[PDB]
Amino acid sequence: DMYIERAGDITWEKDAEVTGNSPRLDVALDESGDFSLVE
Amino acid sequence: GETTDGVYRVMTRRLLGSTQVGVGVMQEGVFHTMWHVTKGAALRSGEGRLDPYWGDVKQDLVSYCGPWKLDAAWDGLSEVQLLAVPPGERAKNIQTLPGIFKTKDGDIGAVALDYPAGTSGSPILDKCGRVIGLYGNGVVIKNGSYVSAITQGKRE
Ligand SMILES: C[C@@H](CN)N1CCc2sccc2C1
Known part of the structure; x- marks a missing residue:
């Protein structure tokens, strides 16, 4: 039995921590909604 | 409620x-x-x-309770924020420049940030605070890191 609990507002925050790269990937999406890498 | x-x-x-x-x-x-x-x-x-x-x-x-309401889209150029809500931890904004998932049916923005599986559904936002998709459906690449699609629905 699942339940929900509020965790915050949805707002852009100035000076948030900035990280993560920006990879360009060839992918395939199957009928079950799973993504896989195409090589 | x-x-x-x-x-x-x-x-x-x-x-x-x-x-x-x-x-x-x-x-x-x-x-x-x-x-x-x-x-x-x-x-x-x-x-x-x-x-x-x-x-x-x-x-x-x-x-x-109703039809999908989120219709904002990543502009393809700007940094976005993942509003990560990890299990047992406070909501936190993380800014990043999305990468791209290239598919046979078109390209989708993707965010290279790694959080626990229970973080799935956390929203990705643009600079106006609009939700451009949800985090948590993606892939594991060569170096073992996780990359999530920016998954957005269609507002009918
Ligand atoms: C470690 C990787 C393995 N694919 N995963 C599991 C599934 C999800 S949904 C959000 C984050 C994760 C992390």
């Missing part, structure tokens, strides 16, 4: 203690999350019940 717009944790008491299985967005009276978080089950909000209204396994999305 609580109908205020915002980001919410999705919890279950079926396992050990109270476990966070995902996250979602309440907007215009509709609850939005990824299909793999709830498997399309009904949800509770206080003494109230939220019933599924639309869902699609291939898109990995589901809406409750």
Whole structure:
């Protein structure tokens, strides 16, 4: 039995921590909604 | 129950203690999350019940109480923020420049940030605070790192 609990507002925050790269990937999406890498 | 717009944790008491299985967005009276978080089950909000209204396994999305309301899109150029809501931890904004998933049916933005599975459904936002998609359906690349699609629904 699942339940929900509020965790915050949805707002852009100035000076948030900035990280993560920006990879360009060839992918395939199957009928079950799973993504896989195409090589 | 609580109908205020915002980001919410999705919890279950079926396992050990109270476990966070995902996250979602309440907007215009509709609850939005990824299909793999709830498997399309009904949800509770206080003494109230939220019933599924639309869902699609291939898109990995589901809406409750009404049709999918989120229609903003990544502009393809700007940094975005993941409003990460990890299990047992405070909501935190992380800014990043999305990468791209290139598919046979078109290109999708993707965010290279790694959080626990219970963070699935956390919203990705643009500089106006609009939700451009949900985090949590993606792939594991060569170096073992996780990259999530920016998954967005269609507003009918
Ligand atoms: C470690 C990787 C393995 N694919 N995963 C599991 C599934 C999800 S949904 C959000 C984050 C994660 C992290």
